[PDB]
Amino acid sequence: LEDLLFYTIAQEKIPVHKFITALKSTGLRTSDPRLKECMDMLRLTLQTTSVMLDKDLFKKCVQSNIVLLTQAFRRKFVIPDFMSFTSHIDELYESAKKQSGGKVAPDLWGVSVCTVDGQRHSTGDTKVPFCLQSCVKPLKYAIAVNDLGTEYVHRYVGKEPSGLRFNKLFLNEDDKPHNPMVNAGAIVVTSLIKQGVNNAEKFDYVMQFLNKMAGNEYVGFSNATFQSERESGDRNFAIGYYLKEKKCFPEGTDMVGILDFYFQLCSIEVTCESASVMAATLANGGFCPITGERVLSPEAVRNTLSLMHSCGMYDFSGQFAFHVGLPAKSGVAGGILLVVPNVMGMMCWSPPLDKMGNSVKGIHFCHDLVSLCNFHNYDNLRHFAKKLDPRRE
Amino acid sequence: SLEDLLFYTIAEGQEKIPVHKFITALKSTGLRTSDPRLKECMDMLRLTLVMLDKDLFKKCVQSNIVLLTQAFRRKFVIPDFMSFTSHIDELYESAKKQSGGKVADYIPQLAKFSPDLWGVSVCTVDGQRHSTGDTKVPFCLQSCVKPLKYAIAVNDLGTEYVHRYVGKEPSGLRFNKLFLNEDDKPHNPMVNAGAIVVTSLIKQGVNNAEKFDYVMQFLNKMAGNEYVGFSNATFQSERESGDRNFAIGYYLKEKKCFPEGTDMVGILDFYFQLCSIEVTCESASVMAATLANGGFCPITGERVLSPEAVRNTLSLMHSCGMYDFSGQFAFHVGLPAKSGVAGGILLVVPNVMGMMCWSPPLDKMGNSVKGIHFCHDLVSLCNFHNYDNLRHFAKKLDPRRE
Amino acid sequence: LEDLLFYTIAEKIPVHKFITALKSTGLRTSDPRLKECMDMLRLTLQTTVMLDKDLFKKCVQSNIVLLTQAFRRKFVIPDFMSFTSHIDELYESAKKQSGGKVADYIPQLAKFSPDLWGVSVCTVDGQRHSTGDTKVPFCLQSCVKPLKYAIAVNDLGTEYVHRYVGKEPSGLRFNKLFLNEDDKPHNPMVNAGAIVVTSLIKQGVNNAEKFDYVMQFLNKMAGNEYVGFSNATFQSERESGDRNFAIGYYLKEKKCFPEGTDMVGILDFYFQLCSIEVTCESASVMAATLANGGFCPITGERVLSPEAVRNTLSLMHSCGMYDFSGQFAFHVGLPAKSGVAGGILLVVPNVMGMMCWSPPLDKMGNSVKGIHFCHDLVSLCNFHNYDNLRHFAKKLDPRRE
Amino acid sequence: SLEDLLFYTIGQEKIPVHKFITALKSTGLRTSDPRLKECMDMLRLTLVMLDKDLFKKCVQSNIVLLTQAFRRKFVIPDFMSFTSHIDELYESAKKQSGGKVADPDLWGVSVCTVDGQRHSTGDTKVPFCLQSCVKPLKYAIAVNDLGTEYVHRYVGKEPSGLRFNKLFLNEDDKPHNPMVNAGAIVVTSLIKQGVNNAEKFDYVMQFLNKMAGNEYVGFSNATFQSERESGDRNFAIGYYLKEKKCFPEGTDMVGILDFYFQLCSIEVTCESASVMAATLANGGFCPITGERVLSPEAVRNTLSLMHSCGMYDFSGQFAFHVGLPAKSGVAGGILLVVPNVMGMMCWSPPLDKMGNSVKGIHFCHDLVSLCNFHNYDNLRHFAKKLDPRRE
Ligand SMILES: O=C(Cc1cccc(C(=O)O)c1)Nc1nnc(N[C@@H]2CCN(c3cccnn3)C2)s1
Ligand SMILES: O=C(Cc1cccc(C(=O)O)c1)Nc1nnc(N[C@@H]2CCN(c3cccnn3)C2)s1
Secondary structure, X not given: OHHHXXXXXXXOOEEHHHHHHHHHHOOOOOOOHHHHHHHHHHHHHHHOOOOEEOHHHHHHXXXXXXXXXXXXXXXXXXXXXXXXXXXXXXXXXXXXXXXXXXXXXXXXXXXXXXXXXXXXXXXEOOOOOEEOHHHHHHHHHHHHHHHHOHHHHOOOOOOOOOOOOOOOOOOOOOOOOOOOOOHHHHHHHHXXXXXXXXXXXXXXXXXXXXXXHOOOOOOEEOHHHHHHHHHOOHHHHHHHHHHHHOOOOOOOOOHHHHHHHHHHHHOEEEOHHHHHHHHHHHHOOOEOOOOOOEOOOHHHHHHHHHHXXXXXXXXXXXXXXXXXXXXXXXXXXXXXXXXXXXXXXXXEEOOOEOOOOOEXXXXXXXXXXXXXXXXXXOOOOOOOOOOEOOOOO | OHHHHHHHHHXXXXXXXXXXXXXXXXXXXXXXXXXXXXXXXXXXXXXXXXXXXXXXXXXXXXXXXXXXXXXXXOOOOOOOHHHHHHHHHHHHHHHHOOOOOEOOOOOHHXXXXXXXXOXXXXXEOOOOEEEEXXXXXXXXXXXXXXXXXXXXXXXXXXXXXXXXXXXXXXXXXXXXXXXXXXXXXXXXXXXXXXXXXXXXXOOOXXXXXXXXXXXXXXXXXXXXXXXXXXXXHHHHHHHHOOHHHHHHHHHHHHOOXXXXXXXXXXXXXXXXXXXXXXXXXXXXXXXHHXXXXXXXXXXXXXXXXXXXXXXXXXXXXXXXXXXXXXXXXXXXXXXXXXXXXXXXXXXXXXXXXXXXXXXXXXXXXXXXXXXXXHHHHHHHHEOOOOOOOOOOOOOOEOOOOO | OHHHHHHHHOOOEEHHHHHHHHHHOOOOOOOHHHHHHHHHHHHHHHOOOEEOHHHHHHHHHHHHXXXXXXXXXOOOOOOHHHHHHHHHHHHHHHHOOOOOEOOOOOHHHHOOOOOOOEEEEEEOOOOEEEEEOOOOOEEOHHHHHHHHHHHHHHHHOHHHHXXXXXXXXXXXOOOOOOOOOOOOOOOOOOHHHHHHHXXXXXXXXXXXXXXXXXXXXXXXXXXXXXXXXXXXHHHHHHHOOHHHHHHHHHHHHXXXXXXOOOHHHHHHXXXXXXXXXXXXXXHHHHHHHHHOOOEOOOOOOEOOOHHHHHHHHHHHHHHOOHHHHHHHHHHOOOOEEEOOOOEEXXXXXXXXXXXXXXXXXXXOOOEHHHHHHHHHHHHHEOOOOOOOOOOOOOOEOOOOO | OHHHHHHHHOOOOOEEHHHHHHHHHHOOOOOOOHHHHHHHHHHHHHOOEEOHHHHHHHHHHHHHHHXXXXXXXXXXXXXXXXXXXXXXXXXXXXXXXXXEOOOOOOOEEEEEEOOOOEEEEEOOOOOEEOHHHHHHXXXXXXXXXXXXXXHOOOOOOOOOOOXXXXXXXXXXXOOOOOOOHHHHHHHHOOOOOOOXXXXXXXXXXXXXXXXXXXXXXXXXXXXXXXXXXXXXXXXXXXXXXXXXXXXXXXXXXXXHHHHHHHHHOEEEOHXXXXXXXXXXXXXXXXXXXXXXXXXXXXHHHHHHHHHHHOOHHHHHHHHHHOOOOEEEOOOOEEEEEEOOOEEEEEEOOXXXXXXXXXXXXXXXXXXXXXXXXXXXXXXXXXXXXXXXXXX
16 A cells, blocks of 8 residues: 555655655645654654655655545545645635725635645635634534534524524524524523533633634634623623523523623634634534544534524525525624535635625635535536536546 | 446346346336336337347347446446335335324315325436335325426526515515515515516416416426326316415515516416426426436436526525425425425435425424425435535435445 | 573674674584574565564574574684684695605596695584685595594494404504404504405495495585595506505405405495595584584584594594604694595594695605694694693693683 | 681581581592691681681681682582492402412502592502502603603604514614603613712602602612512613613613612502692692692603503503503502593502503493593593583
């Protein structure tokens, strides 16, 4: 298997740089956690002789990681021609870049891609930290369903868009918040997680869960955003008191403590790069693609994607489901967390928002992405007219 | 050569293949001997008529060799079809025990149907077929026709024109009491007001008899020429008790929701006719499979609908297709479906198969009790939910795999 | 007594002096209750311009009760001349407000000059005053809604009528919903409620007889002044009545009609009732019948039961001015009903009826000049439902010397 | 002279004091009436037989009021016959024993006419909290001090219609009216702005004392503590209004909520509350003191909104059948105004499903079935009703 792969890259010896170039062109990064042993071995070899790899040295280096390297080089990844795909991503990025309207809650614009096989691409401002805000709502819902199951969670929150052209009603007709993607629903979801412990431990628990979803890439916290959310959270206090009065919380809930935790969760920071990996975990059935670790149950992921599909883009949710047909979640910092199930996760970020509250550039990019590729939920992988299918050669 | 390869597969060391042995093997892939794409092969077999040498076999199968090769090399979307239909039969028998609900009675033609009629038909995107129960009994599409006529409208007129007159979203728990959204358009094509507007868009400028003929011809193609009929007795009854639909018609007219030059009372007549179109589970499953197969009819290979028409139809069936149960159905079942008052549920598994489930008794939401029960069990068993993962699906079975 | 009254007006009374004094009370010489007196005066000017004690007694004796109340300043508004002078000033002030749009949805409405403006007053004692265009016929339209509701309650009682229609404003939900939560039209003053009310009247006879019955009832309310019919308005209403057909089918589906109703026949009758014509003068008498507990003030006949009148006034108060109803109830505080021809039927209970008419409508559908006049009227006089009769700051109380 | 005329009406040489007192009470006035203070002081100084001269000395300072009383010029001339009807209505409502006390057999009705004629039956001297019955009173204070235009920049003027009171704000982002909780909360924020809550409360208490002609007004600290501990719905309203900028600039919203709970906890008796209602019936003048308490504008606006908005979700039915401005509260009080005639307070703790006192609702319907008091009854033609304004 090491030999087979040796011949593919070879003709007596392989220069190390040639192996690295070929590896990167598959879309994997040399820092990928699943390539740690291989890359450690290569570094050790460049020490123990001072740039050329025979059959035997090669086998020694790649043997621990041979399954993944074989899939990579045999073009078995979900997107086999990754270089051609990222060239299209860059063109969509540049086209969205020209849409400069909208209002910040301005010129920063980044897009990151992580496939379900861990292939990575970034364009623009993808290493700048920003708060998740409402992008965290699907993530904490997934955690709640993961730990508690669908039946328990949906005793407290509903499963459908309100329809009302406003977040204006807090409760559906059964006295539950409409869904986990609206503020009242996210507040109730927050109350379900890790009940019985203090806020510091609840927060640590959620942070550890997000670290795993992001394959240990950047997850941080903006104390400045937290302070500001809590000082202008009058609408959220209104929701909290309303839910308390209507008995919407689990028995023994400290409602004002839950609101504080809620503001903390909104203030969690990511980059486009780290958030794309979180989205890829959702695209990959709850397994983190760059570590192989099982993070969320399949039930948690399926429910989260269903509700992002119908409820994730504020009052634009219905239009977005129809035209784009992908589970997505927007936030006021300008983030759009986007999932292409079975294919990839993305995070798009540009601060200026349209009248609906959605990033202008991200919305434009999402429409162009589905115009180009047969990724709409109800596109037919068989016949798709003029679209490109990046899953094929 | 391809015919020879296939000859050896069926021959298994023998010099000649008995005809019955070829037919049995063919049926076990899921294809029917009547499949329109196997016409030349079956014609040749009839001309030959009970033993087939290499040469005679090649003469018979040569015109249809591509399809027969895919069949016998287990390349169909569901390779182990026999095992799959065994699961379908178990789900069928389990739903059969759920005999609650009430048959619709508001007209004599609905009230007449036995509560105990129950059929399920499957047609995969490769034309593999299976039926259990009462699958050859005609019943009216009723609201099951709504996605089909919307697909026709989008096919002929494009998304932009159609959605100038009808919206694209569920109204939400505002029930179905409001006829128009805030932009004075019916909320979507799956509610009565939206379907009435859609009906006014089709084949404009010709009389109702020609509009109806056109729609009937279109449904014939979607069904691969299987049973499509018309119930004049249902039509007469719909039209005499259609007070709610007349209220909608006058309301839309007042709010100028129709294309210029519309004869609103004539459109209502056409609407009642379309609701009275009859299918069987068998023929409707093929229509659903056309939608699962990106607009190509799987048992004919004919392009019937544009990709845009099919995608838009499936999107709206997903969110709007099961009356007030639409949101719950989208969440738990996660498949585009459309129910009707005759007890039909038209069900699409994109890229995999179409189905029609039919049982007259309806739940409190208006949906077939047995069909709803079957749809839940189907997705509990198989990784067919829209947001199931194709790689990691816990203990579900994936019928696309060996 | 005739003698007492003789001395009040008096050795001999010139006829012209008796007539001018009579007119200054606000009564008209044509008042039906003065017929015998005026007949006797005309006969006297034929036989034998001067009236001694004896001739006077012969003339006024048949009508002496009414003439005594008139001359002893016992009418509801004793200084009527001073009151009508205020009415005229309010009229002239509203005349300057010439904004709004004439209704155009049918040719018969679109036709009316924006500048037509009339106000007529009829007190509960039959005192009359008109200013401006008060003898021009126009269709009641929605102004007929309280009148046919009153007829229904008169003939059938409150409990029967309110089995089919509700008793409350829908709330600023506007009038997009045809039915309340109990599947009844919200009240008799909205189109769906008026359609159901129409189905209750004179059931079991044909439309021609239903119409004749309503017309005879309106004639009595108007003390036999002008009540007519605009066939041209009727034809136009019926050919563009799409919204009303929508309501009719909706009500039929929801079983809102009395058993055996011919819904399309009811719609036809509904359009006929909307096309009934009045003048400001004749409609003010209809409003005065409602102000006077169901007795027509110029004939003394009782047109409607006390129950019918009370219920009609209650619903005009809360539901009568379309989406402006709540604002109108708060600021003006009088039962009123508007219509798309520019009419405002206005009732001051225990005091008077009025009809204000000016075609140009505001954005709510109410006559701009009529609305302006109604506000000024209550700013000036202590007529608001919740003004006090004893302590009213700087308002004038016309029912007081 | 007026004292002499009155002397003759009450053909002896001398009037026993008891005979003057019993005749006075039969007009409906009480001997403690503040407007009869000088007369009753003089009688006490005199103390049992009164000649022409002594009588004149006693009644002279109050002679105008005593003349109206004895000449049957009061709004209800045959008061004794009227109170006999009130007692029958009282006994008939007494038999309606359903409903649930807010989480019991007490029943009182008090009448005060616009002329200060008084009658009570049942439990009319037991203190209970106004609760929502305070809403029209504080709205009247706000309009009195600030005018209609300013107040209605912050609160609307109409019933919401909506199934219940599920929406806090109308389409213009104002609470629908002053009689719903959100509207009363905004009204509370308008009163005596810029001073602390203790002074705002003192000011309102002084205003209520005048409306009640100085009869019983108290405060239930126990009710206040309970309202604030379970006021989650009111905190939701407060935060919602704050977010939508519904309060005057510089408002301390949590302080306003505290004041709101205090105002709900003010105590009255049926007797003292009937006088407050009579102030509203009498154009803003307190009938038993003659003092001007509220502007005519404040009173008219208050009565208009009580008419359409005062009886929770029963308001539209009540307006149609009863046709009188009224305001109910969760302690079982119904404050009722018959404009130009009288105020009443009905109190019985058990409430119907709408939140209204069962006995009070029954009494209000019977009162208008009997008498031509509906706002759209006619004063000349009224079928078989009794008109208590006539002899
Ligand atoms: O109708 C129901 C379901 C429900 C909620 C509570 C009780 C029931 C029941 O009757 O069982 C039903 N939902 C509701 N959700 N939220 C409501 N009110 C909140 C606070 C006030 N508000 C608005 C919005 C716009 C304008 N003004 N105020 C939104 S009402
Ligand atoms: O006002 C909007 C626009 C719109 C659309 C979606 C939501 C809203 C909203 O209420 O916020 C408004 N649309 C409407 N569509 N249909 C309406 N009325 C029809 C006939 C009468 N009717 C009913 C229903 C129940 C009871 N009574 N009559 C249905 S009015």
